[model samples]
Target: SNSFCVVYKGSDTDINNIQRDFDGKGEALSNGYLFIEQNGHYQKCEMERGTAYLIGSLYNRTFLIGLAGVWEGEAYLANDAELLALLFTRLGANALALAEGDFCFFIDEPNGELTVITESRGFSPVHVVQGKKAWMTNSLKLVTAAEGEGALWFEEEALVCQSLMRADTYTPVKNAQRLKPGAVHVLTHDSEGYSFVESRTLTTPASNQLLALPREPLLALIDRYLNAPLEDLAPRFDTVGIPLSGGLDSSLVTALASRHFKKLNTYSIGTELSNEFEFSQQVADALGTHHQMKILSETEVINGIIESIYYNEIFDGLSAEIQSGLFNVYRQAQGQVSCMLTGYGSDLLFGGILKPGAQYDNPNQLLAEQVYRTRWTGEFATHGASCYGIDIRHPFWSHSLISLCHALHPDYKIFDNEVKNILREYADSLQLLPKDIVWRSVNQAFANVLGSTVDNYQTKSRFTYRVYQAFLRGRLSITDVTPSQLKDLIK
Candidate 1:
């Protein structure tokens, strides 16, 4: 679930009397520092403390949020709050350098300052509205719901354009901004009141600048990271589940993970008329996992589409279906699994989609969009799974793994018309999956598995577009969803 926070800077007495119904719409999630505490001129809160709010007292008076929990690393303080303290010690003004997991911190010290930093991938974007006070959190819906006395709902055409372009950090609710990945938005209170400034702190080196090694050694390293995360994840919870698709990505995940977890639970659910389960069932039959498959009704897809609009905060029809692809598997995963691993963020870094004559596109620009677009991926997964109390972790999305993927040779990613060839072949070389499971002609996973599960070929992705048109109306339609310039191409 997305973390919620609001901080203010004033005299200590002003802090004592500070007040705001943070959950004015009853929307804050049940996780970390989820309480409104007026400790001087500061108000710290979360809907509930699902995790520890390691406030840094040693160097910078800091409050940390999101994935702030027990860590295998050294703990500086009791209850795993030591991570933030250590982070503050290492990088005070440059806290974004401490980018590994999901975390957003506000540094409130000399004269009052708030620094909002999302994950390295910017998967979970932190939204902020800097008015007389600085309110920062991830939920645009909650922020919109608690808009002043009534409700704040306005459709900005710029935001619509941003959504259409799948631009990162663009909130539907205008004026509310999202903190970019590896970037820090510092809200400093000065004579001009609270002013906003930003900086991009962390970055991945160019893929071509690095050496392109063979797939043999790459397999070993892949095992270490991907295998380790999946192995470590499932054991933490008794019931482990994976949302398996016919695609090589999830096939490899199931094969590699099934080794560590033989009784591994696997889920496969799709649109009302989907029949893709046959492909996954073949893999599941080969692996001997406890497979669970179901066909979703059209109503479920429609409701899921509407629900995902808020969960992902993107109003695009394709984006809505892309998100529901996960929920289809997740809904049935209810009691069967507590931990779920996925293959998201793999294709983007590797050669999943190669534009036609996208010509001389700056690798930096590619990486920027690559990192930014995944924001909705994380938000949808985390938010939806939270409802079922299921924990979703993406091994492919780990910072180092994504960087490793980017470092590969271009030929390995895209060989003429072949895409992600090296990754496909590497999975096969390991003998973890059959060639049928590991190798195939590419990019069908999106429109075929993800997009196909919702709307069939050339249907009305016109769902969110109509909502947008209505938004142009009185806009109180009480309903709404990404880019979709093209209908589904028969790959």
Candidate 2:
């Protein structure tokens, strides 16, 4: 039932006053209001119909108003409000077309046009109606409140609808059309009626284009982007959590971040006899970072499976093993670290041993095409499913960064014998990482801790069987699967 609804009118009425009217609907109806005054002024107040809403005035000409449910978590006014206001103000009406997130919002541009934006995943249902009058609400009942036509019964599976009216008639009705993930709906007043327009499309970087930056310069650019957000997000934290696996990716993140903090804190988890625990400690010692390691028991893994499924929001079965263990470790930390960084996405970009197989000839290009279509895209899709709703931020997946990496000449980008060789070359140039560590293979860290255990039949067999079972269950449809079913499988 989680959803967001928004409405706009061509009036300069007090935004706070409008919020007050909405708040009075009831605590359940308006739990919290994050209102930005027309002026640059901002005000946030807990919803209390009996009490006047806190109305702060702003100096900026255009501001944003946001509202959300109580369970959605605290309103991060500084980041959420200011960032959104600036973006919308910069993009003008087009801002409405780019809106996304877990909640829905309405924006009123200076030109008096109103638009509604919601999470594209339809996890948050947003509906609208426009006719002689225009109205919008979170639920169908609200549409009925406006004296609109009866709810329209569309097909069961269709998730998007522009007008609730039937094809034969233009009268408005309560039609349940979902907003696709990453979609924006623009509402404009026209002589015929209210015009709804979708203005978003799937855009990705040009395939296999190299970015123009040199290796050192590219590394610096990434460092700046990654570190800037963390600095802004957490400036004076006493401790930060890092999942250290003694691998190159996690090690590099920890090493770079350690310079700014007073204490470098990390955690690792593995089976009791797993070598990862020992190697993680070795990395922690070598890097002089404080660390904790937890060994998982079979009983604990099985017990936590259900909760992990809910948190992860998928039934793949095997992927939750590490996450379930990590959840327990995170709870044990008890807020010692407010934020944690992981070594995700590095493997896809750098670790896969694609360089050696790469060829500058046409045959190489053909193979690369095959890999992109058959393997890489499918892997990324699978990853999105396993993470559930959590926004898995990947530094390597950054559009600009990946674009640059892909654009490199085959000779420069492809590493035939070693994986992530380009990264290793750049790491050496920066002098920030050891060559031994940078050039280490995927199994180097594992070998230090597990010896030959990772290659043993018992461990390998379990992983193989689980993967086979996942494939048998139709969870491994690969990328060529229909777009509609892919969307459902991801959720």
Candidate 3:
């Protein structure tokens, strides 16, 4: 659901070449029209009365492109395509400003122009290679393949920083750059060349003032965003599951979700090196929900690390390691459930991973930076879940809730030497979880494993870079990788 490509100012041959490659991976969704899903059913709908061709992913409900998960929201019109078509018909390229959630849209305007828009926080990863002509898609390899040898070069400096997890990952293609979050690019082509008519990039501002602890409003919002999706999906799927790390975020979702579905299932992953199963199992028992845990060998996790690279296309080591275990969580949920929910975005939004003991000089900016750096994990969920053919949703990504978290006082984020203190207090008040789970300082299972797997920074960087090279060369595969082989490659 996250796959799409738009070729502007290119010849029919160029479009054909790109589309051929894109179609192999992401089938042309209704021949380049908007295909939307409600519940478990999907249909193709024309946008703007067939005057505008809508490509990429769109949903009436709130959704992120990673794993193509559609969450609950107010769908103004019963038909999502109708609402989108109506907006575009009236608002043109500015329609996205009126929309919610994260999305990437390629609009073939009625005026022989293309309006490309990605939500300010859309993390689905859109890469644009442009000069006289522009190629945009979620897949770097596809764009590079269509452009041939000229597009094969990697941005050495950017890739290095990305591999080290010091910055957001950039498209490896030297001539290509990632579309900045919340961007609108309008393009037109002539006999000579293509030109960008207008470009407006949007940024989300952090809240400047503290929102006092009314608590009711925040709780209401959480329930609305979380409950609505569960209610909507309940009739469609008999069971839905969540990845419960026994941390505050997942445990909170588990407690709330347990009340909604009759057959709610919770999952956790464990390894010889580390596991949250003890705590997670406690949560499941307390909530009285069905719980399952999978223990992976170091070999399996190594394979997962390689696959995470191949599927997500961003070579960040920690995310690869984290998603490796989470990938199996999605895998285990595959046949048993149609969709899964994650408590992602809660940490960044509410300041969970902030400075341990020191007070921040500017708390809002620090939280925003945390939000920005790890924002792509939403896309990681998208691509990672797509691997297992499951739809994943994030309740904590609700825009209003995010704004509330940004507005919360920094003291609430970390108080009395406790991170996510407000959340811990809220959960404690609920009495749904044990005090320990509510106050768990951090979830570092993946980090602990990654520590034992790679001993040094340079070694890890070299290994991830090698994986990137192998991925670009089409040699990396989850099935072919082993811990020993990965070690040898890293060496």
Clashing residue pairs found in predicted model 1: 15-40, 15-41, 31-50, 32-50, 34-46, 35-46, 314-481, 315-481, 316-481, 316-482
Mind giving the per-residue lDDT tens digits that candidate 2 earns over 1-491?
Answer: 12123334412232233333222221211222222212212222221112121111111111222322122223234344443444444454344323332344444444434444443222233445442334444333333322323323322122212211122112122243333333455556566555565545323325654445566676676666445434533454646667777767776767666765667677876654454665567667766877887665544443333233332222222233334554544544544665555565555444443546644453334433432331111112212221222222223433334345444544444556565666566555555555456563222222222234534423322332333223323343222333343223323
| Candidate 3 lDDT tens digits, 384-473 | 565466667776765556667776767778766668876776677778898888873012333343463343444444556577666654
Candidate 1 residue 1 C-alpha distance from true site, Å: 4.9
* Backbone clashes counted, model 3: 3
lDDT of 1 by residue, 1-491 (tens): 43444535322222222223222112122211122222201123321212224321111111232322333234323232445544544445355444444445554333345444455554455666653345565544433333332233455444453433455555555555666656655655557664566656545444456447776787677667676566555555655788888777887887878766646888877664445687888788888788888777654555455455544454565566566667766778876776787776667766666653343344334654665566643343355565465667777766556667655666666675566776777677766566666764111333443345432422323445344333322232232221221222111
Better of 1 and 3 by lDDT: 3
lDDT of each prediction vs. the true structure?
0.52, 0.40, 0.60
Consecutive 10-residue window with the lowest summed lDDT within model 3: 33-42
After superposition, candidate 2 runs with Cα above 4 Å error:
1-79, 93-105, 108-181, 186-199, 202-213, 234-236, 302-305, 315-329, 351-399, 406-414, 428-436, 440-491
Residue pairs clashing, model 3: 66-382, 67-382, 120-182
Count of backbone collisions within predicted model 1 = 10
In candidate 1 the C-alpha lDDT for residue 364 amounts to 32
